[PDB]
Write a protein that holds these residues in place. Structure first.
Motif, PDB file in Angstrom:
ATOM      1  N   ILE A 195       0.837  -1.201   0.000  1.00  0.00           N
ATOM      2  CA  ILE A 195       0.000   0.000   0.000  1.00  0.00           C
ATOM      3  C   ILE A 195       0.875   1.255   0.000  1.00  0.00           C
ATOM      4  O   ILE A 195       0.674   2.158  -0.812  1.00  0.00           O
ATOM      5  CB  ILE A 195      -0.987   0.011   1.196  1.00  0.00           C
ATOM      6  CG1 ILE A 195      -2.081  -1.044   0.987  1.00  0.00           C
ATOM      7  CG2 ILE A 195      -1.595   1.402   1.397  1.00  0.00           C
ATOM      8  CD1 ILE A 195      -2.911  -1.325   2.231  1.00  0.00           C
ATOM      9  N   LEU A 252      -2.641   4.339  -3.827  1.00  0.00           N
ATOM     10  CA  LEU A 252      -3.166   3.906  -2.545  1.00  0.00           C
ATOM     11  C   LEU A 252      -2.619   4.677  -1.345  1.00  0.00           C
ATOM     12  O   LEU A 252      -3.372   4.960  -0.412  1.00  0.00           O
ATOM     13  CB  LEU A 252      -2.953   2.399  -2.352  1.00  0.00           C
ATOM     14  CG  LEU A 252      -3.586   1.435  -3.368  1.00  0.00           C
ATOM     15  CD1 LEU A 252      -3.103   0.017  -3.118  1.00  0.00           C
ATOM     16  CD2 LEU A 252      -5.105   1.490  -3.342  1.00  0.00           C
ATOM     17  N   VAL A 299      -4.506   7.852  -0.008  1.00  0.00           N
ATOM     18  CA  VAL A 299      -5.806   7.490   0.541  1.00  0.00           C
ATOM     19  C   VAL A 299      -5.606   6.809   1.901  1.00  0.00           C
ATOM     20  O   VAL A 299      -6.235   7.168   2.888  1.00  0.00           O
ATOM     21  CB  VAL A 299      -6.624   6.595  -0.440  1.00  0.00           C
ATOM     22  CG1 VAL A 299      -7.997   6.270   0.144  1.00  0.00           C
ATOM     23  CG2 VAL A 299      -6.759   7.289  -1.792  1.00  0.00           C
ATOM     24  N   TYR A 300      -4.684   5.853   1.954  1.00  0.00           N
ATOM     25  CA  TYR A 300      -4.398   5.148   3.191  1.00  0.00           C
ATOM     26  C   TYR A 300      -3.989   6.123   4.289  1.00  0.00           C
ATOM     27  O   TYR A 300      -4.514   6.073   5.398  1.00  0.00           O
ATOM     28  CB  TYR A 300      -3.293   4.119   2.937  1.00  0.00           C
ATOM     29  CG  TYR A 300      -2.923   3.282   4.136  1.00  0.00           C
ATOM     30  CD1 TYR A 300      -3.683   2.169   4.491  1.00  0.00           C
ATOM     31  CD2 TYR A 300      -1.817   3.602   4.913  1.00  0.00           C
ATOM     32  CE1 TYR A 300      -3.342   1.393   5.582  1.00  0.00           C
ATOM     33  CE2 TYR A 300      -1.471   2.838   6.016  1.00  0.00           C
ATOM     34  CZ  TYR A 300      -2.241   1.734   6.346  1.00  0.00           C
ATOM     35  OH  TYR A 300      -1.913   0.962   7.442  1.00  0.00           O
ATOM     36  N   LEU A 355      -6.667   8.107   6.162  1.00  0.00           N
ATOM     37  CA  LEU A 355      -7.601   7.378   7.014  1.00  0.00           C
ATOM     38  C   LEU A 355      -7.152   7.304   8.462  1.00  0.00           C
ATOM     39  O   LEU A 355      -5.957   7.343   8.764  1.00  0.00           O
ATOM     40  CB  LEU A 355      -7.795   5.949   6.495  1.00  0.00           C
ATOM     41  CG  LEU A 355      -8.381   5.785   5.095  1.00  0.00           C
ATOM     42  CD1 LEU A 355      -8.285   4.330   4.675  1.00  0.00           C
ATOM     43  CD2 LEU A 355      -9.816   6.279   5.009  1.00  0.00           C
ATOM     44  N   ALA A 401      -8.778  -1.155   4.773  1.00  0.00           N
ATOM     45  CA  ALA A 401      -7.987  -1.073   3.551  1.00  0.00           C
ATOM     46  C   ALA A 401      -7.001  -2.236   3.441  1.00  0.00           C
ATOM     47  O   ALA A 401      -6.848  -2.841   2.363  1.00  0.00           O
ATOM     48  CB  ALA A 401      -7.251   0.266   3.480  1.00  0.00           C
ATOM     49  N   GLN A 438      -8.926  -5.466   2.553  1.00  0.00           N
ATOM     50  CA  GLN A 438      -9.257  -5.495   1.126  1.00  0.00           C
ATOM     51  C   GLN A 438      -8.068  -5.889   0.263  1.00  0.00           C
ATOM     52  O   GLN A 438      -8.174  -6.734  -0.623  1.00  0.00           O
ATOM     53  CB  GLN A 438      -9.750  -4.125   0.668  1.00  0.00           C
ATOM     54  CG  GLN A 438     -11.239  -3.920   0.739  1.00  0.00           C
ATOM     55  CD  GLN A 438     -11.705  -2.811  -0.195  1.00  0.00           C
ATOM     56  OE1 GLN A 438     -11.222  -1.687  -0.124  1.00  0.00           O
ATOM     57  NE2 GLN A 438     -12.637  -3.132  -1.077  1.00  0.00           N
ATOM     58  N   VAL A 439      -6.924  -5.250   0.504  1.00  0.00           N
ATOM     59  CA  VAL A 439      -5.708  -5.545  -0.270  1.00  0.00           C
ATOM     60  C   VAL A 439      -5.247  -6.984  -0.029  1.00  0.00           C
ATOM     61  O   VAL A 439      -4.805  -7.667  -0.953  1.00  0.00           O
ATOM     62  CB  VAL A 439      -4.575  -4.541   0.060  1.00  0.00           C
ATOM     63  CG1 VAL A 439      -3.215  -5.032  -0.451  1.00  0.00           C
ATOM     64  CG2 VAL A 439      -4.892  -3.186  -0.519  1.00  0.00           C
ATOM     65  N   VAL A 456      -7.733  -4.068  -6.085  1.00  0.00           N
ATOM     66  CA  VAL A 456      -8.139  -2.749  -5.602  1.00  0.00           C
ATOM     67  C   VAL A 456      -7.980  -1.695  -6.706  1.00  0.00           C
ATOM     68  O   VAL A 456      -8.565  -0.619  -6.633  1.00  0.00           O
ATOM     69  CB  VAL A 456      -7.426  -2.347  -4.272  1.00  0.00           C
ATOM     70  CG1 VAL A 456      -7.934  -0.999  -3.763  1.00  0.00           C
ATOM     71  CG2 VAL A 456      -7.664  -3.408  -3.206  1.00  0.00           C
ATOM     72  N   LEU A 466     -12.145   4.800  -3.653  1.00  0.00           N
ATOM     73  CA  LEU A 466     -10.953   5.399  -3.049  1.00  0.00           C
ATOM     74  C   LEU A 466     -11.076   6.905  -2.902  1.00  0.00           C
ATOM     75  O   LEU A 466     -10.724   7.477  -1.866  1.00  0.00           O
ATOM     76  CB  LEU A 466      -9.721   5.091  -3.906  1.00  0.00           C
ATOM     77  CG  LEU A 466      -9.222   3.650  -3.922  1.00  0.00           C
ATOM     78  CD1 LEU A 466      -8.161   3.478  -5.001  1.00  0.00           C
ATOM     79  CD2 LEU A 466      -8.689   3.240  -2.550  1.00  0.00           C
ATOM     80  N   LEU A 516     -13.577   7.718  -0.187  1.00  0.00           N
ATOM     81  CA  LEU A 516     -12.941   7.502   1.108  1.00  0.00           C
ATOM     82  C   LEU A 516     -11.984   8.640   1.463  1.00  0.00           C
ATOM     83  O   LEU A 516     -12.010   9.132   2.586  1.00  0.00           O
ATOM     84  CB  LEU A 516     -12.207   6.149   1.148  1.00  0.00           C
ATOM     85  CG  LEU A 516     -13.089   4.900   1.102  1.00  0.00           C
ATOM     86  CD1 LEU A 516     -12.244   3.662   0.825  1.00  0.00           C
ATOM     87  CD2 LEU A 516     -13.889   4.728   2.384  1.00  0.00           C
ATOM     88  N   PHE A 558     -15.279   0.541   6.905  1.00  0.00           N
ATOM     89  CA  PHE A 558     -15.023   1.776   6.158  1.00  0.00           C
ATOM     90  C   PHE A 558     -16.075   2.848   6.438  1.00  0.00           C
ATOM     91  O   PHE A 558     -15.751   4.039   6.449  1.00  0.00           O
ATOM     92  CB  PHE A 558     -15.041   1.530   4.648  1.00  0.00           C
ATOM     93  CG  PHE A 558     -13.749   1.017   4.067  1.00  0.00           C
ATOM     94  CD1 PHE A 558     -13.755  -0.127   3.274  1.00  0.00           C
ATOM     95  CD2 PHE A 558     -12.546   1.696   4.252  1.00  0.00           C
ATOM     96  CE1 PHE A 558     -12.587  -0.595   2.682  1.00  0.00           C
ATOM     97  CE2 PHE A 558     -11.375   1.232   3.664  1.00  0.00           C
ATOM     98  CZ  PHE A 558     -11.392   0.079   2.881  1.00  0.00           C
TER      99      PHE A 558
HETATM  100  C1  LIG Z   1      -9.759   1.544   0.509  1.00  0.00           C
HETATM  101  C2  LIG Z   1      -8.839   2.499   0.662  1.00  0.00           C
HETATM  102  C3  LIG Z   1      -7.657   1.964   0.380  1.00  0.00           C
HETATM  103  C4  LIG Z   1      -7.877   0.642   0.048  1.00  0.00           C
HETATM  104  N1  LIG Z   1      -9.178   0.403   0.139  1.00  0.00           N
HETATM  105  C5  LIG Z   1      -6.788  -0.347  -0.334  1.00  0.00           C
HETATM  106  C6  LIG Z   1      -5.399   0.317  -0.362  1.00  0.00           C
HETATM  107  C7  LIG Z   1      -5.201   1.532   0.566  1.00  0.00           C
HETATM  108  C8  LIG Z   1      -6.278   2.620   0.404  1.00  0.00           C
END
Ligand SMILES: c1cc2c([nH]1)CCCC2
Length: 163
Positions: A78, A84, A87-88, A91, A99, A102-103, A111, A118, A121, A153
């Motif tokens: 990530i 990514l 966004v990560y 959060l 996240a 999901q990955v 993803v 994304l 988010l 999320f």
């Molecule tokens: C929702 C946000 C993010 C993911 N899902 C996967 C990788 C990091 C950022």
């Protein structure tokens, strides 16, 4: 709750080679061995991963070792991903776990198809993001797991897991 406990719930723990939800040879706590239909190829991947001749079976300690490696590699991936990382980093800690989850399940190819989600988010449009996340093959194929991850999320709480 933390990322290890969360993924342990979602992935289970099995000490013998089994097929995952997509039909792929896997072991431990969601450790994918190969997408090959050849069990012998899966056994070879297992032996390479563990460093001994396992003949398709590992111990709990070995499963937990692969799990540690896989979670770490998922997170690090990530951070190395230009789409990514921002966004990560936007959060909170609980949503970061969603996240990672999901990955872990889908990989970064998977993803890659969640770009629109994304953006929502990163904008902290939580209900909108949750609606968008469910419009996916991911949701349709693994709905009870995706519902838990999406609730995480949406809320930034562990409500979908704490029970
Ligand atoms: C929702 C946000 C993010 C993911 N899902 C996967 C990788 C990091 C950022």
């Amino acid at each position: 709750m933390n990322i290890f406990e969360m993924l342990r719930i979602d992935e289970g723990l099995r000490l013998k080679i089994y097929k995952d939800t997509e039909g792929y040879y896997t072991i431990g706590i969601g450790h994918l061995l190969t997408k090959s239909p050849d069990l012998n190829a899966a056994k070879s991947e297992l032996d390479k991963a563990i460093g001994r001749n396992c003949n398709g079976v590992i111990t709990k300690d070995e499963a937990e070792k692969l799990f540690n490696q896989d979670v770490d590699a998922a997170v690090r991936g990530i951070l190395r991903n230009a789409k990514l990382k921002p966004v990560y980093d936007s959060l909170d800690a609980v949503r970061r776990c969603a996240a990672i989850n999901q990955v872990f399940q889908m990989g970064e190819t998977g993803v890659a198809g969640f770009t629109n989600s994304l953006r929502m988010l990163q904008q902290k449009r939580w209900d909108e993001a949750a609606v968008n996340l469910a419009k996916s093959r991911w949701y349709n194929q693994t709905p009870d797991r995706a519902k838990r991850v999406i609730t995480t999320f949406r809320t930034g709480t562990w409500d979908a897991y704490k029970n």
